[PDB]
Design a protein around this ligand. Structure first.
Ligand SMILES: COc1ccc2c(-c3ccc(C(=O)O)c(C4CCCC4)c3)ccnc2c1
Length: 281
């Protein structure tokens, strides 16, 4: 182990888009936390080398980690991770973010041969709806919703984690020309060279749909090892359900509406919350 102020850093417990997460014992309150460890110089290099003056690269890449911190400081919800401390010396390269620990870790790593039952998928999906509606109300889009970023706590409820690429918008929605994400979870409107911008909140809904499909089938609905073919399938392949496991028709309807390739007609979170599959047991 190693010592960092009042914390004793132990094994790696996660690795997200940036940095690594360590188990950290706080000697002041005899409690374990999760500590994300980052290198400022490594974050700057991850955005790419800057271009000589003549999809524009941001001028100051280090601003995204400080946006992530500002976003996390704003959020207090039982289905969202809780940032408790930031350790950041301006004369040091490392940055540390301390979170309340969510003991069981990620709910699923896609693909899996052990999907969730329909009733357990509903319980976790109800948690995901609560967390996402709260983020959207706080004018936050997550941009990387997938099962591996949903942590299961001691209480069996999930918390949304990995805000590394999250964005705060002004107004009613985020207006995007391009976006980040895990390709198998990216919405079709984000994968074409077009003149048209798209809604950030509808990207999160599409990713919730791919997540729910993963919860019950253990793999994404559109999949290919060849990136160009994956993008083509997301944009042009009709959604299909495997013959087994057999799932309820109302669940198929909900997933179909979340995975509407047209973001204008795609179901919105206030409607998802009242869908018959979500409100029954
Ligand atoms: C038991 O295992 C864990 C692992 C990560 C945790 C975290 C945590 C903190 C920050 C990030 C991030 O990269 O931004 C992450 C990601 C790493 C991969 C999954 C999401 C997790 C928080 C609280 N309890 C955790 C418990």
């Amino acid at each position: 182990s190693m010592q960092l102020n009042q914390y004793t850093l132990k094994d790696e417990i996660g690795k997200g888009s940036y940095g690594v997460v360590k188990l950290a014992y706080n000697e002041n309150d005899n409690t374990y936390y999760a500590m994300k460890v980052l290198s400022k110089k490594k974050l700057i290099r991850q955005a790419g080398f800057p271009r000589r003056p003549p999809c524009i690269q941001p001028r100051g890449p280090i601003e995204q980690v400080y946006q992530e911190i500002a976003i996390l400081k704003k959020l207090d919800h039982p289905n969202v991770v809780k940032l408790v401390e930031v350790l950041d010396d301006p004369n040091e390269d490392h940055l540390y973010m301390v979170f309340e620990l969510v003991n069981q870790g990620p709910v699923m790593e896609v693909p899996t041969l052990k999907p969730l039952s329909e009733d357990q998928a509903r319980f976790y999906f109800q948690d995901l709806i609560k967390g996402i509606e709260y983020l959207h109300y706080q004018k936050i889009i997550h941009r990387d919703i997938k099962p591996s970023n949903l942590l299961v706590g001691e209480d069996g409820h999930i918390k949304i984690a990995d805000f590394g690429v999250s964005n705060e918008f002004k107004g009613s929605d985020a207006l995007l020309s391009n976006t980040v994400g895990t390709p198998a979870f990216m919405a079709p409107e984000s994968l074409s060279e077009t003149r048209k911008i798209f809604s950030g909140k509808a990207l999160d809904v599409w990713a919730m749909g791919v997540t729910l499909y993963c919860f019950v089938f253990g793999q994404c609905p559109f999949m290919d090892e060849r990136i160009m073919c994956l993008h083509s399938k997301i944009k042009s392949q009709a959604l299909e359900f495997p013959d087994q496991p057999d799932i309820a028709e109302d669940l198929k309807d909900l997933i179909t509406r979340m995975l509407d390739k047209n973001p204008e007609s795609r179901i919105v979170v206030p409607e998802i919350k009242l869908h018959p599959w979500v409100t029954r047991h």
